[model samples]
Target: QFLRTDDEVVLQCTATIHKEQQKLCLAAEGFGNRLCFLESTSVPPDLSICTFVLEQSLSVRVLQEMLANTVEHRTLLYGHAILLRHSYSGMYLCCLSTSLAFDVGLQEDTTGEACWWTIHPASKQRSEGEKVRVGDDLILVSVSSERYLHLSYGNSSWHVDAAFQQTLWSVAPI
Candidate 1:
């Protein structure tokens, strides 16, 4: 388990599902302590991405549960954490430390289906399409047709989903 304080700012998330194939992107949209965005889709003619807002304090635990549930059959998740900082008016610096991992590249082309980005040899022992593990990268579970960007902290879960999108992975500084 991880601990945090008011000064020890943290950003926690579990997962975000993008039913759409739209490339799930996240960024500090405006110049404030808050962030906002939309989700889109392409393959099945979907709508836009929804804006997901969150509180500063409960970011960590929400992500833990979501990510844990996302990778239920896995053992490792890169043990990664990211700190997102925003400069409001180029003065007040707000830092959100996010500690959660999953395979975003995996997705489905439709709604109400299981889409995954990774395939593990061991998963064959289960069902035909019951498990998905991103080849040595991450695992994905319970994905919708719309593109979903999920983030969790403590008991909270938030997501900005699109219609059609792709998943990309990048490295971040902690």
Candidate 2:
């Protein structure tokens, strides 16, 4: 499966960069999206790397922009795998399924496909927001379960609803 994003989906993320088995916050230095690791408590002003663009292809790569008024910030969603953080909950969408019956969960940090999702647009309507647009509501199917991620009513938990509209989710870049 290939992951596709609306043109309005500007992905900005902050994660712990592991180098030589050492974990550090992935931050930027200087002007533009010059990526580097910060090992301190204080967050930098340019801690965002949102200038990248997404490529519409199977193999993915995020291109860094060095100039203004240029389309340089690009990132690729390889094999449709992406990390999605809920806009309201601040929790990552996770797949806890052990079999075809996909059970979804939320976690701060999880290993493997539990924390990854393949984004599918629900409609053509463009998302609206100040800093980030919601783009189209997404249908996230787990790579493990191959089932749609549905939000359970009342409980607000997620499960594999399988081809149900309840699996549609409104997500944005964190």
For candidate 2, lDDT tens digit of each residue in 1-174?
122342323222222223322212222223432222233223334434212122222211221121122533233232344554433234455566443244444555634445655555555542221122244345556654556655332233212333334344443333
Residue 44 CA error for candidate 2 (Å)?
28
Q: TM-score of predicted model 2? A: 0.38
Question: 1-174, model 1: which lDDT tens digit per residue?
Answer: 121212222122224445522333333333333333223223112221221111122222444555566663122222222222222212111211221332222111211122211211222243332322222222122232223233322343344322233222321112
lDDT (0 to 1) per candidate: 0.26, 0.37
Q: Supply the TM-score for candidate 1.
A: 0.23
After superposition, the stretches of candidate 2 with alpha carbons farther than 4 Å from their true spots are 1-79, 85-92, 98-101, 107-111, 123-133, 154-166
- What is the Cα-based lDDT of residue 52 in candidate 2? 18
Model 2 whole-model lDDT (C-alpha atoms): 0.37
Q: Using TM-score as the measure, which candidate wins?
A: 2
Clashes of 1: 54
